[PDB]
Amino acid sequence: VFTTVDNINLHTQVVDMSMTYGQQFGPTYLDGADVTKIKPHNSHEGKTFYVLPNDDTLRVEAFEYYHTTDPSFLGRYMSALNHTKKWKYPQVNGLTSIKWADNNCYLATALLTLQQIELKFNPPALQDAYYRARAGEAANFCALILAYCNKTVGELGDVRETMSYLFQHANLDSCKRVLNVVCKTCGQQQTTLKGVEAVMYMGTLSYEQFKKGVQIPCTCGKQATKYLVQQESPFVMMSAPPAQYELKHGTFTCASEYTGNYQCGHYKHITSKETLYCIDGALLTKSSEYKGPITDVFYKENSYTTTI
Ligand SMILES: Cc1ccc(/C=N/O)cc1C(=O)N[C@H](C)c1cccc2ccccc12
Ligand SMILES: [Cl-]
Ligand SMILES: [Cl-]
Ligand SMILES: [Cl-]
Ligand SMILES: [Cl-]
Ligand SMILES: [Zn+2]
Ligand SMILES: [Zn+2]
Ligand SMILES: [Zn+2]
Ligand SMILES: [Zn+2]
């Protein structure tokens, strides 16, 4: 056979057929299916098995492909893959979605979002898989998202939490956010955020409203105003607890709709194209206007400076 950790560097092994894989290699998977305690069948000649890293060469190759040394990662990935490879990944409005299964509504929403914003993932394994997802084969990429986010298939998922974890694995170093804070008493303080903190705000959906200002607590004890001075990023994510919100054609890129109770509710995806499209897994509706419960909105950006 061939053992690997990255499916790029293949290492030639000949096995014994009287001994389990797990005896000879440690935990060994096949296409997501744990074959640790199984022995070699005949239709196992020259196939390729993932192995837990058990020597320095494999640890270094694993870090260089996944950007983690966590010894649980591989098995969490292979356990998610074993489901994600059985999901359906329909093309809907020229985007790869996911057919509803195992509480994946939040992954479908994340996947659709990721195909409409500009993002470079640092770990090769994520970048390679993102590319393959864009081109319709997204099983691998969904398993990796589950593994990187410390989520198992069936677990209830927040889209903002998932985007936050993915952004922390993306190149957002360039990204810069300058805010000014205005209290009557303490006065005026400016702060510079970089990376993930530069593209995410929790507390309003409206990029407009962030530019005009929003009321926040001051440590003095008064109410103060936070407004956006300077934004340097290819997008921004604007998030709030779900509430009725109107979405106008052409004024945003895409949004997360969330219906029902904390945790056990369901997401759908709103995207602005030539009209508004609602993507609910395999299902597609369209309308010229939209009002409904929204918790995330994504906007395009490059360079913004305020006129205040
Ligand atoms: C679906 C989900 C999964 C996990 C979690 C939190 N884990 O720590 C949260 C949610 C959630 O209900 N998120 C939505 C979008 C949400 C986020 C924030 C506040 C909310 C208040 C009422 C109802 C939903 C609310
Ligand atoms: Cl890293
Ligand atoms: Cl399954
Ligand atoms: Cl679901
Ligand atoms: Cl990373
Ligand atoms: Zn990294
Ligand atoms: Zn399943
Ligand atoms: Zn103050
Ligand atoms: Zn769901």
From Swiss-Prot:
Impact after mutating T69L: Increased cleavage of ubiquitin in vitro; no effect on ISG15 cleavage in vitro
Binding site for Zn(2+) 4: C183, C186, C218, C220
Tree of life domain: Viruses
Domain Ubiquitin-like: 1-51
Outcome recorded upon mutating C105A: Unable to remove host IFIH1 (MDA5) ISGylation
Zinc fingers typed C4-type, residue spans: 183-220
Record's subunit section: May form homohexamers. Interacts with N protein.
Protein name per Swiss-Prot or TrEMBL: Papain-like protease nsp3
Species: Severe acute respiratory syndrome coronavirus 2
Span of the entire protein shown here: 1570 to 1877 of 4405
